[PDB]
Amino acid sequence: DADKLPHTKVTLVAPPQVHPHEQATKSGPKVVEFTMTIEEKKMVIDDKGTTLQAMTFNGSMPGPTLVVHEGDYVQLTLVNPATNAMPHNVDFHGATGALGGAKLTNVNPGEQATLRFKADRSGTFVYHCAPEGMVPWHVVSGMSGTLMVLPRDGLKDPQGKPLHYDRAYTIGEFDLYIPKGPDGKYKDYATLAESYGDTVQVMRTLTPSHIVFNGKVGALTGANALTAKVGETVLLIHSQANRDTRPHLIGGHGDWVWETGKFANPPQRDLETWFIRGGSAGAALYTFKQPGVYAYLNHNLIEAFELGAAGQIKVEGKWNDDLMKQIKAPAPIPR
Amino acid sequence: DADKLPHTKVTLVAPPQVHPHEQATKSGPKVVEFTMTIEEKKMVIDDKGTTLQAMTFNGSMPGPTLVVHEGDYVQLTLVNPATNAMPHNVDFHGATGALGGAKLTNVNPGEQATLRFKADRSGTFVYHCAPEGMVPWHVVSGMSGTLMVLPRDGLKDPQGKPLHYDRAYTIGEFDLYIPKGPDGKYKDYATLAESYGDTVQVMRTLTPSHIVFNGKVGALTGANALTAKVGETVLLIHSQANRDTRPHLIGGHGDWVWETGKFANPPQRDLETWFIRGGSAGAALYTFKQPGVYAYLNHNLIEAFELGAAGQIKVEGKWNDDLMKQIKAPAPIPR
Amino acid sequence: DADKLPHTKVTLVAPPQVHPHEQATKSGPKVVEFTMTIEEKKMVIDDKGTTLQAMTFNGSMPGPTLVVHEGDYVQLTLVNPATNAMPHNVDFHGATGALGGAKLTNVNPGEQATLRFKADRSGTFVYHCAPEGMVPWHVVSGMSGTLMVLPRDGLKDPQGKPLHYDRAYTIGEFDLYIPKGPDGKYKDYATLAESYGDTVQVMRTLTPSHIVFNGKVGALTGANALTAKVGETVLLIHSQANRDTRPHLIGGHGDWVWETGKFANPPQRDLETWFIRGGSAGAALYTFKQPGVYAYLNHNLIEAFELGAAGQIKVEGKWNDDLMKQIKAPAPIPR
Ligand SMILES: [Cu+2]
Ligand SMILES: [Cu+2]
Ligand SMILES: [Cu+2]
Ligand SMILES: [Cu+2]
Ligand SMILES: [Cu+2]
Ligand SMILES: [Cu+2]
Ligand SMILES: [Zn+2]
Ligand SMILES: [Zn+2]
Ligand SMILES: [Zn+2]
């Protein structure tokens, strides 16, 4: 009975980081309490100044990742401040009943609600806004993130051996549908409401104008690159609430991957590219063996390089000539 | 030798139901006899009166689901009445040889044929029309369905334990390519033949005008919703003969899913969203734990909510506060 | 230490064949040496004379398949002749570090380089060109192929039993983005450089003009069909470096399939249709049981029949009435 369990309070952090948590734990079930505040805002999503009339959990695309253990209860307070214009709610794919909690969390600007559900299944799960009659619009405008439900005894390989990560990153991939006017330039809207009609028209073509990681072209590149070092194991959580994607680490692999994102199933090993179904989150582990800059991208290369679905991981450490060596550098072809 | 085996005759039923059958059986192999009659007809496929010049097995999209056991022989009589205009045939993905039976079942209006094949592999398999030179047109116009070949000892989990369903539903998802005229309104054609050229042009864009379950927007919503009760296990068979889809039960899960649809492989558990490859049928089991209206949809939410790929399941029973509880209903934010 | 190992030299062959190699081997690790020469050339890609300003490894789309065993080192000499116009490189998904080798193999026309890497993971892996700032263009213009890294003790089924193939074929599937002029006819460009801008514009629509196997509509049909006989096991290697596809053998199955292409994972059996993620290569085994012409195609049937993604396998041997029989040929419907 959930009423009798101990409560904990978790402080969320902004993507691409994930809040501190244990993997395997000696702890028993708890009611883990979280709070999120919705923020509607205009965001610049590319390097030429295009804006999106966006909608977010906690001010970020994606929303923050929530981490619990299997058998915990998630207790979320969702706040919709009066400065917003639209009603919102939340649908947790990790939850059972009431359209994922959406029917129980309908909040108009100025309102809040608290939902509890039992996280009875391990895996990474999408959560997203789903207001009746406007579901796709709120999702493509930015209202999604991940709930990770870890097995109480941590991650396991196909033979039941322990797996772990030393750091976790969360990447949300967003297919955007920005309208254009008769001059072929992207439209800039004064309000969220004014963007709706034109956006629906672009959506129905099924062709995104942009496909971005974490809300913007280059959000995870250069100074914003993810980091690691040789010998460190990273967990890359990848969510796509609306459209398929195919993650790939250039120069690396998915050592252990749950592409459907559900940890009670055996992972696959040695993947070059994996597949995240629209409406899901998946998870890959990789242990770095070489230093350098890696590209982490959607391997539809047009979607990555032209539309925005690409980031970087900068890795410290010692180069390994056994794994790879330039035997002969570029030089004139012998005559 | 199939000539010496007992024959049975099966009476088909209209989707979304599936004809009565056993799962695990003490019965030995049989020749199971079915009949289907092709019907070409104009169908209304949305709520604004758009029509499709359609082609069907047995008058429905999808055609009916045929169920046998592994080691049975399927013996189909395919009838193409003289009231039709086009030649047709059938390609069973569950069969071996002769382009799935298509080369042996070419029937002009006024003709019929009978094919037998050994169902030697367990799983859900697409069948579809495939006339030489017009294959995509007959498929996208509605000529597909599912053959389910159950293991003789029923479904099994990854550890070899028994799985079962208490009721089965069949959902065919159809990407449609309806042409428009210069006024931007959908075209209405007097005959099937007259729709061909314009439709091919839309097909080649790869952008469906509509994506529907069971032949129409809302075919499985409201009064037409699927039904179940708390404690009942449902099998959802999902076929897509031409294009990928990603099924999801909102408020629920895929407890056990064969997304590639082949029962000799272990199922995955706890899925939020699964993936049906274009040209295949998959199968998910779920046991209801909460009452209420569930949405069952393609989780490209634009494809679901804008284009039509969404239905409902209405579930009777008792609400379970342990699984989910509204701790605080929507109410003003405390000052 | 790779410096002390024996070297071998492998002579590559043109797709759809694969160079002679052993599956299970008693041999220890070697440094396997290969050479490829890049050729830019204009190619005719359909039956109406459309051209592509193409880029290739070794003159073919796809490039040749390279085969080694797990624990071998691949040592590639990449040659970019002075007759070419563009810089090139190579990214092996089977390799670890330096963006797959791309950072170490940047070759201008008139240059060459030699890369070595350890093939420490079994599976079929894409390799492709990836010059900074032009990655998608070189890939969609034809610069991809497969590296197959076989387990030293050969392929294995889910229970660890031996699997084998008697012949191997390699199929590269290419989504092409050919521009059109104001008359609606495809453009013919005098040089590779002149095709770039217009092609990028088509790419960004995400709609291919053509999707072809092995560089052209019909490249694997008719006189160019693959061949086999009843009782022979074929391995079909299928690569797609940019876009998802869904292979299917009409009249057959994937007996054992590694759709993510990585041999340390158990294969799935009895597939009707499998899924190759954009940016990967997969592998299917099938043992023929019936003679005849089979179609091997992408089962988005519009992509196959309208856009080009279809071939044939012509199979010799004896028809098997137990597997399939025409009980009654097409004939008038009884009155
Ligand atoms: Cu919202
Ligand atoms: Cu959802
Ligand atoms: Cu037909
Ligand atoms: Cu088919
Ligand atoms: Cu190149
Ligand atoms: Cu790549
Ligand atoms: Zn570690
Ligand atoms: Zn039951
Ligand atoms: Zn053999």
mmCIF file with all atom_site columns, C-alpha atoms in Angstrom, chain B residues 53-172:
data_model
loop_
_atom_site.group_PDB
_atom_site.id
_atom_site.type_symbol
_atom_site.label_atom_id
_atom_site.label_alt_id
_atom_site.label_comp_id
_atom_site.label_asym_id
_atom_site.label_entity_id
_atom_site.label_seq_id
_atom_site.pdbx_PDB_ins_code
_atom_site.Cartn_x
_atom_site.Cartn_y
_atom_site.Cartn_z
_atom_site.occupancy
_atom_site.B_iso_or_equiv
_atom_site.pdbx_formal_charge
_atom_site.auth_seq_id
_atom_site.auth_comp_id
_atom_site.auth_asym_id
_atom_site.auth_atom_id
_atom_site.pdbx_PDB_model_num
ATOM 1   C CA . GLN B 1 53  ? -12.248 3.624   -55.250 1.00 0.00 ? 53  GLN B CA 1
ATOM 2   C CA . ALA B 1 54  ? -11.501 0.577   -53.171 1.00 0.00 ? 54  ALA B CA 1
ATOM 3   C CA . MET B 1 55  ? -10.719 -3.046  -53.677 1.00 0.00 ? 55  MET B CA 1
ATOM 4   C CA . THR B 1 56  ? -11.363 -5.676  -50.989 1.00 0.00 ? 56  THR B CA 1
ATOM 5   C CA . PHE B 1 57  ? -11.265 -9.278  -49.984 1.00 0.00 ? 57  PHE B CA 1
ATOM 6   C CA . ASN B 1 58  ? -14.751 -10.153 -48.693 1.00 0.00 ? 58  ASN B CA 1
ATOM 7   C CA . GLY B 1 59  ? -16.058 -6.549  -48.692 1.00 0.00 ? 59  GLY B CA 1
ATOM 8   C CA . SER B 1 60  ? -13.881 -5.273  -45.820 1.00 0.00 ? 60  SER B CA 1
ATOM 9   C CA . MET B 1 61  ? -10.593 -3.411  -45.242 1.00 0.00 ? 61  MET B CA 1
ATOM 10  C CA . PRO B 1 62  ? -8.708  -5.359  -44.080 1.00 0.00 ? 62  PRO B CA 1
ATOM 11  C CA . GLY B 1 63  ? -9.847  -8.693  -45.415 1.00 0.00 ? 63  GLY B CA 1
ATOM 12  C CA . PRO B 1 64  ? -10.801 -11.187 -42.730 1.00 0.00 ? 64  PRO B CA 1
ATOM 13  C CA . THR B 1 65  ? -8.174  -12.868 -40.580 1.00 0.00 ? 65  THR B CA 1
ATOM 14  C CA . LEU B 1 66  ? -7.655  -16.576 -41.371 1.00 0.00 ? 66  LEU B CA 1
ATOM 15  C CA . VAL B 1 67  ? -6.502  -18.732 -38.432 1.00 0.00 ? 67  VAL B CA 1
ATOM 16  C CA . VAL B 1 68  ? -4.852  -22.143 -38.632 1.00 0.00 ? 68  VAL B CA 1
ATOM 17  C CA . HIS B 1 69  ? -2.210  -24.086 -36.667 1.00 0.00 ? 69  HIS B CA 1
ATOM 18  C CA . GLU B 1 70  ? 1.388   -24.789 -37.645 1.00 0.00 ? 70  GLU B CA 1
ATOM 19  C CA . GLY B 1 71  ? 1.463   -27.925 -39.836 1.00 0.00 ? 71  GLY B CA 1
ATOM 20  C CA . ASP B 1 72  ? -2.063  -27.370 -41.197 1.00 0.00 ? 72  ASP B CA 1
ATOM 21  C CA . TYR B 1 73  ? -2.635  -26.714 -44.875 1.00 0.00 ? 73  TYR B CA 1
ATOM 22  C CA . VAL B 1 74  ? -4.583  -23.660 -45.951 1.00 0.00 ? 74  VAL B CA 1
ATOM 23  C CA . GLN B 1 75  ? -6.855  -24.307 -48.905 1.00 0.00 ? 75  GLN B CA 1
ATOM 24  C CA . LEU B 1 76  ? -8.343  -21.102 -50.239 1.00 0.00 ? 76  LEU B CA 1
ATOM 25  C CA . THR B 1 77  ? -10.941 -20.665 -52.919 1.00 0.00 ? 77  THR B CA 1
ATOM 26  C CA . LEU B 1 78  ? -10.620 -17.160 -54.317 1.00 0.00 ? 78  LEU B CA 1
ATOM 27  C CA . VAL B 1 79  ? -13.656 -15.871 -56.251 1.00 0.00 ? 79  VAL B CA 1
ATOM 28  C CA . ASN B 1 80  ? -13.592 -12.834 -58.540 1.00 0.00 ? 80  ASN B CA 1
ATOM 29  C CA . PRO B 1 81  ? -17.240 -12.116 -59.487 1.00 0.00 ? 81  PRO B CA 1
ATOM 30  C CA . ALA B 1 82  ? -18.160 -10.874 -62.952 1.00 0.00 ? 82  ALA B CA 1
ATOM 31  C CA . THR B 1 83  ? -19.439 -7.648  -61.400 1.00 0.00 ? 83  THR B CA 1
ATOM 32  C CA . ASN B 1 84  ? -15.790 -6.655  -60.796 1.00 0.00 ? 84  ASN B CA 1
ATOM 33  C CA . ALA B 1 85  ? -13.683 -4.843  -63.392 1.00 0.00 ? 85  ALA B CA 1
ATOM 34  C CA . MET B 1 86  ? -10.089 -5.904  -62.652 1.00 0.00 ? 86  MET B CA 1
ATOM 35  C CA . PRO B 1 87  ? -8.108  -9.147  -62.422 1.00 0.00 ? 87  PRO B CA 1
ATOM 36  C CA . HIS B 1 88  ? -6.882  -10.150 -58.965 1.00 0.00 ? 88  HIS B CA 1
ATOM 37  C CA . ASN B 1 89  ? -4.905  -12.854 -57.169 1.00 0.00 ? 89  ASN B CA 1
ATOM 38  C CA . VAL B 1 90  ? -3.427  -13.560 -53.724 1.00 0.00 ? 90  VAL B CA 1
ATOM 39  C CA . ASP B 1 91  ? 0.098   -13.625 -52.243 1.00 0.00 ? 91  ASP B CA 1
ATOM 40  C CA . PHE B 1 92  ? 0.283   -15.272 -48.817 1.00 0.00 ? 92  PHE B CA 1
ATOM 41  C CA . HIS B 1 93  ? 3.481   -14.288 -46.981 1.00 0.00 ? 93  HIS B CA 1
ATOM 42  C CA . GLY B 1 94  ? 2.885   -17.409 -44.867 1.00 0.00 ? 94  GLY B CA 1
ATOM 43  C CA . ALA B 1 95  ? 3.299   -19.641 -47.957 1.00 0.00 ? 95  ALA B CA 1
ATOM 44  C CA . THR B 1 96  ? 6.357   -20.996 -49.820 1.00 0.00 ? 96  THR B CA 1
ATOM 45  C CA . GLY B 1 97  ? 6.642   -20.733 -53.620 1.00 0.00 ? 97  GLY B CA 1
ATOM 46  C CA . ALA B 1 98  ? 5.062   -19.139 -56.707 1.00 0.00 ? 98  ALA B CA 1
ATOM 47  C CA . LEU B 1 99  ? 5.251   -15.555 -55.388 1.00 0.00 ? 99  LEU B CA 1
ATOM 48  C CA . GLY B 1 100 ? 3.182   -16.552 -52.357 1.00 0.00 ? 100 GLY B CA 1
ATOM 49  C CA . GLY B 1 101 ? 0.514   -18.173 -54.548 1.00 0.00 ? 101 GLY B CA 1
ATOM 50  C CA . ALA B 1 102 ? 0.017   -15.132 -56.767 1.00 0.00 ? 102 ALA B CA 1
ATOM 51  C CA . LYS B 1 103 ? 1.205   -16.990 -59.935 1.00 0.00 ? 103 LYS B CA 1
ATOM 52  C CA . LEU B 1 104 ? -1.378  -19.736 -59.249 1.00 0.00 ? 104 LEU B CA 1
ATOM 53  C CA . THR B 1 105 ? -4.424  -17.604 -58.435 1.00 0.00 ? 105 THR B CA 1
ATOM 54  C CA . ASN B 1 106 ? -4.749  -15.103 -61.291 1.00 0.00 ? 106 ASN B CA 1
ATOM 55  C CA . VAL B 1 107 ? -8.515  -14.637 -61.580 1.00 0.00 ? 107 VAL B CA 1
ATOM 56  C CA . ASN B 1 108 ? -10.302 -12.418 -64.123 1.00 0.00 ? 108 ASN B CA 1
ATOM 57  C CA . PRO B 1 109 ? -13.833 -11.181 -63.373 1.00 0.00 ? 109 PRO B CA 1
ATOM 58  C CA . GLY B 1 110 ? -16.094 -14.257 -63.669 1.00 0.00 ? 110 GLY B CA 1
ATOM 59  C CA . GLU B 1 111 ? -13.342 -16.702 -62.539 1.00 0.00 ? 111 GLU B CA 1
ATOM 60  C CA . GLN B 1 112 ? -12.208 -18.526 -59.395 1.00 0.00 ? 112 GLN B CA 1
ATOM 61  C CA . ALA B 1 113 ? -9.290  -20.662 -58.253 1.00 0.00 ? 113 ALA B CA 1
ATOM 62  C CA . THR B 1 114 ? -8.250  -22.838 -55.328 1.00 0.00 ? 114 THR B CA 1
ATOM 63  C CA . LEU B 1 115 ? -4.759  -22.785 -53.827 1.00 0.00 ? 115 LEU B CA 1
ATOM 64  C CA . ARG B 1 116 ? -3.375  -25.052 -51.147 1.00 0.00 ? 116 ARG B CA 1
ATOM 65  C CA . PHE B 1 117 ? -0.217  -24.429 -49.152 1.00 0.00 ? 117 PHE B CA 1
ATOM 66  C CA . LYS B 1 118 ? 1.383   -25.786 -46.022 1.00 0.00 ? 118 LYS B CA 1
ATOM 67  C CA . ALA B 1 119 ? 1.368   -23.342 -43.092 1.00 0.00 ? 119 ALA B CA 1
ATOM 68  C CA . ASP B 1 120 ? 4.722   -24.590 -41.835 1.00 0.00 ? 120 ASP B CA 1
ATOM 69  C CA . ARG B 1 121 ? 5.736   -21.444 -39.924 1.00 0.00 ? 121 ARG B CA 1
ATOM 70  C CA . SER B 1 122 ? 4.028   -19.905 -36.903 1.00 0.00 ? 122 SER B CA 1
ATOM 71  C CA . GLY B 1 123 ? 3.137   -16.196 -36.755 1.00 0.00 ? 123 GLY B CA 1
ATOM 72  C CA . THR B 1 124 ? 0.873   -13.484 -38.125 1.00 0.00 ? 124 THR B CA 1
ATOM 73  C CA . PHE B 1 125 ? 1.498   -13.053 -41.891 1.00 0.00 ? 125 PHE B CA 1
ATOM 74  C CA . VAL B 1 126 ? 0.164   -10.520 -44.389 1.00 0.00 ? 126 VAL B CA 1
ATOM 75  C CA . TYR B 1 127 ? -1.725  -11.739 -47.438 1.00 0.00 ? 127 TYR B CA 1
ATOM 76  C CA . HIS B 1 128 ? -2.453  -9.294  -50.278 1.00 0.00 ? 128 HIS B CA 1
ATOM 77  C CA . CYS B 1 129 ? -3.394  -8.982  -53.914 1.00 0.00 ? 129 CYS B CA 1
ATOM 78  C CA . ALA B 1 130 ? -0.487  -8.730  -56.335 1.00 0.00 ? 130 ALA B CA 1
ATOM 79  C CA . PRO B 1 131 ? -1.472  -8.568  -60.029 1.00 0.00 ? 131 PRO B CA 1
ATOM 80  C CA . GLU B 1 132 ? 1.554   -8.142  -62.297 1.00 0.00 ? 132 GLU B CA 1
ATOM 81  C CA . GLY B 1 133 ? 2.145   -4.502  -63.139 1.00 0.00 ? 133 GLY B CA 1
ATOM 82  C CA . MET B 1 134 ? -0.414  -3.129  -60.622 1.00 0.00 ? 134 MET B CA 1
ATOM 83  C CA . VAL B 1 135 ? 0.755   -4.477  -57.286 1.00 0.00 ? 135 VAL B CA 1
ATOM 84  C CA . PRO B 1 136 ? 0.998   -1.267  -55.206 1.00 0.00 ? 136 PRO B CA 1
ATOM 85  C CA . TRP B 1 137 ? -2.366  0.021   -56.482 1.00 0.00 ? 137 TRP B CA 1
ATOM 86  C CA . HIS B 1 138 ? -4.377  -3.056  -55.404 1.00 0.00 ? 138 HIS B CA 1
ATOM 87  C CA . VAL B 1 139 ? -2.615  -3.121  -52.016 1.00 0.00 ? 139 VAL B CA 1
ATOM 88  C CA . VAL B 1 140 ? -3.115  0.561   -51.177 1.00 0.00 ? 140 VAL B CA 1
ATOM 89  C CA . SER B 1 141 ? -6.725  0.356   -52.457 1.00 0.00 ? 141 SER B CA 1
ATOM 90  C CA . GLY B 1 142 ? -7.495  -2.194  -49.707 1.00 0.00 ? 142 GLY B CA 1
ATOM 91  C CA . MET B 1 143 ? -6.535  -5.737  -50.771 1.00 0.00 ? 143 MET B CA 1
ATOM 92  C CA . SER B 1 144 ? -4.706  -7.057  -47.688 1.00 0.00 ? 144 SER B CA 1
ATOM 93  C CA . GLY B 1 145 ? -5.339  -9.001  -44.514 1.00 0.00 ? 145 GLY B CA 1
ATOM 94  C CA . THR B 1 146 ? -3.745  -11.418 -42.059 1.00 0.00 ? 146 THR B CA 1
ATOM 95  C CA . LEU B 1 147 ? -3.164  -15.168 -41.821 1.00 0.00 ? 147 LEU B CA 1
ATOM 96  C CA . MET B 1 148 ? -2.421  -16.202 -38.229 1.00 0.00 ? 148 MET B CA 1
ATOM 97  C CA . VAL B 1 149 ? -0.627  -19.528 -37.860 1.00 0.00 ? 149 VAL B CA 1
ATOM 98  C CA . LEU B 1 150 ? -0.687  -20.495 -34.192 1.00 0.00 ? 150 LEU B CA 1
ATOM 99  C CA . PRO B 1 151 ? 1.847   -22.944 -32.666 1.00 0.00 ? 151 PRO B CA 1
ATOM 100 C CA . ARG B 1 152 ? 0.077   -26.263 -32.063 1.00 0.00 ? 152 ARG B CA 1
ATOM 101 C CA . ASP B 1 153 ? 0.834   -25.950 -28.325 1.00 0.00 ? 153 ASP B CA 1
ATOM 102 C CA . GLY B 1 154 ? -0.158  -22.253 -28.167 1.00 0.00 ? 154 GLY B CA 1
ATOM 103 C CA . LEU B 1 155 ? 1.858   -19.091 -27.594 1.00 0.00 ? 155 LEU B CA 1
ATOM 104 C CA . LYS B 1 156 ? 4.959   -19.156 -25.405 1.00 0.00 ? 156 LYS B CA 1
ATOM 105 C CA . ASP B 1 157 ? 6.943   -16.588 -23.419 1.00 0.00 ? 157 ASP B CA 1
ATOM 106 C CA . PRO B 1 158 ? 10.788  -16.292 -23.645 1.00 0.00 ? 158 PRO B CA 1
ATOM 107 C CA . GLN B 1 159 ? 11.214  -18.948 -20.904 1.00 0.00 ? 159 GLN B CA 1
ATOM 108 C CA . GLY B 1 160 ? 8.794   -21.312 -22.669 1.00 0.00 ? 160 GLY B CA 1
ATOM 109 C CA . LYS B 1 161 ? 5.873   -20.686 -20.295 1.00 0.00 ? 161 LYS B CA 1
ATOM 110 C CA . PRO B 1 162 ? 2.316   -20.616 -21.687 1.00 0.00 ? 162 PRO B CA 1
ATOM 111 C CA . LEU B 1 163 ? 0.720   -17.380 -22.877 1.00 0.00 ? 163 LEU B CA 1
ATOM 112 C CA . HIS B 1 164 ? -2.905  -16.952 -23.975 1.00 0.00 ? 164 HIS B CA 1
ATOM 113 C CA . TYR B 1 165 ? -5.470  -14.407 -25.069 1.00 0.00 ? 165 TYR B CA 1
ATOM 114 C CA . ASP B 1 166 ? -9.170  -14.334 -24.095 1.00 0.00 ? 166 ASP B CA 1
ATOM 115 C CA . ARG B 1 167 ? -10.175 -12.360 -27.130 1.00 0.00 ? 167 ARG B CA 1
ATOM 116 C CA . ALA B 1 168 ? -8.504  -11.368 -30.396 1.00 0.00 ? 168 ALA B CA 1
ATOM 117 C CA . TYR B 1 169 ? -8.962  -8.270  -32.534 1.00 0.00 ? 169 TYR B CA 1
ATOM 118 C CA . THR B 1 170 ? -7.571  -7.571  -35.975 1.00 0.00 ? 170 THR B CA 1
ATOM 119 C CA . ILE B 1 171 ? -6.588  -4.070  -37.097 1.00 0.00 ? 171 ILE B CA 1
ATOM 120 C CA . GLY B 1 172 ? -5.451  -3.339  -40.675 1.00 0.00 ? 172 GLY B CA 1
#
